[PDB]
């Protein structure tokens, strides 16, 4: 059984920051999507252009699994047709997205008493991200005459901020692990099918 490696995406010890989101290419394997219930506990699940109950009947050219952490009240921006600070500057689904967005609360893994400042997000950007564009620049934006020289300050804007997840937060501000499963259908031989 040449099963797709969903485990290393969904069961990864640490997830990426949303601005530096991870992408796993999934090709030439059997995708048993029923195993996702064991890798992620009690997860939210929205599909677009596919029905969630027929995933094991479908064949795709490739699958992509993008993963990152955002706070709970941002999960709604990981959807086609959405705008917001995450959709605009961090991770952008296209309006014609075909795939599923899976999110689950990761407070137990990703919050810390003092705050998890390792998860970060981008604050502003020269333009909105295009679909599946990734911007990991940390360069300080120089607005004034004086060069910044890697020192944020007056007229010198560091473009990221940390979430600082703490377990005292309400769920809307708790960390959620997100996996975006993209289902790519080209006019080409399929390489990812359900068990059937």
């Amino acid at each position: 059984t040449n099963l797709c490696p969903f485990d290393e995406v969904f069961n990864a010890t640490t997830f990426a920051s949303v601005y530096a989101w991870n992408r796993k290419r999934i090709s030439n394997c059997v995708a048993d999507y029923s195993v996702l219930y064991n890798f992620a506990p009690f997860f939210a699940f929205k599909c677009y252009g596919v029905s969630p109950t027929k995933l094991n009947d479908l064949c795709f050219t490739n699958v992509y699994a993008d993963s990152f952490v955002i706070r709970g009240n941002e999960v709604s921006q990981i959807a086609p047709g959405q705008t917001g600070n995450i959709a605009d500057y961090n991770y952008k689904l296209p309006d014609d997205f075909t795939g599923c967005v899976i999110a689950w609360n990761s407070n137990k893994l990703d919050s810390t008493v003092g705050g998890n400042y390792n998860y970060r997000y981008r604050l502003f950007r020269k333009s909105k991200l295009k679909p599946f564009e990734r911007d990991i620049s940390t360069e300080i934006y120089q607005a004034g005459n004086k060069p910044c020289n890697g020192v944020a300050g007056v007229n010198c804007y560091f473009p990221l901020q940390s979430y600082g997840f703490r377990p005292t937060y309400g769920v809307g501000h708790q960390p959620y692990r997100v996996v975006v499963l993209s289902f790519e259908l080209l006019h080409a031989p399929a390489t990812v099918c359900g068990p059937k």
């Epitope: 009240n73 604050l123 502003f124 950007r125 934006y141 607005a143 004034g144 005459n145």
Partner: antibody
């Protein structure tokens, strides 16, 4: 410290037009989304609109859409508000304000404000 | 978007906590966490105090915080000080890069 200075406020009759300007000191103007907000005497703030740092897009509150036009001249470090079809209820202090963050930002707030210019619409 | 509903006035003595509510609709403050607060002293331009419901921009005293429940956001001022006597305006994102202000609350510091 960028300084924002609004000008152009005056007494104007209903139905007439008025252009306000907002001049920014220094050079940071071209890096920031810029906003107009007004405040009628004794009343609350009213958000009017925003123009992207690069002029790529402009957005308007429903209360001024189709009547007021926001523009900017980055070569002059100046923001404009072209007010057409003025009504008594447009009487207010008009503020220009800059986005807290540069580039495309929008989601945070307005951290530097001018002192305002006063528009009195009256016959 | 209709003006967001704030109480007309609130009062407190120095050292007390004071709270100001800001009620909107499911299309503005109930839809977004982009909720900001401004302070305005008499004759002065507004000053940016809170964004993202409870974050403080550079220089704003830690005494200012916020919370939000559904369609209502709150400004929470701990350790009230004489200088906090001012009008306070909430503002919420309303979609499509538009914001709307609340009607304002006059805060009196019994002095």
């Amino acid at each position: 410290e960028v300084q924002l200075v609004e000008s152009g406020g005056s007494v104007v009759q209903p139905g007439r037009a008025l252009r306000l300007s907002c001049a920014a000191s220094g050079i940071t103007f071209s890096s920031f989304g810029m906003y107009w907000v007004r405040q009628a005497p004794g009343k609350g703030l009213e958000w009017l609109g925003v123009i992207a740092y690069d002029g790529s897009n402009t957005y308007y509150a429903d209360s001024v859409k189709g009547r007021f036009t926001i523009s900017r001249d980055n070569s002059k470090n100046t923001l404009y508000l072209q007010m057409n079809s003025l009504r008594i209820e447009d009487t207010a202090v008009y503020y220009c304000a800059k986005d807290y963050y540069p580039l495309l930002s929008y989601y945070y707030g307005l951290d530097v404000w001018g002192q305002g210019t006063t528009v009195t619409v009256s016959s | 978007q209709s003006v967001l509903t704030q109480p007309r006035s609130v009062s407190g003595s120095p050292g007390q906590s004071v709270t100001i509510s800001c009620t909107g609709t499911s299309s503005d403050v109930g839809a977004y966490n982009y909720v900001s607060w401004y302070q305005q002293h008499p004759g002065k331009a507004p000053k940016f105090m809170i964004y993202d419901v409870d974050q403080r921009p550079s220089g704003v005293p830690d005494r200012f915080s916020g919370s939000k429940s559904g369609n209502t956001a709150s400004l929470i001022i701990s350790g009230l000080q004489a200088e906090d006597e001012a009008d306070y305006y909430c503002s919420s994102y309303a979609g499509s890069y538009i914001w709307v202000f609340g009607g304002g609350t006059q805060l009196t510091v019994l002095g």
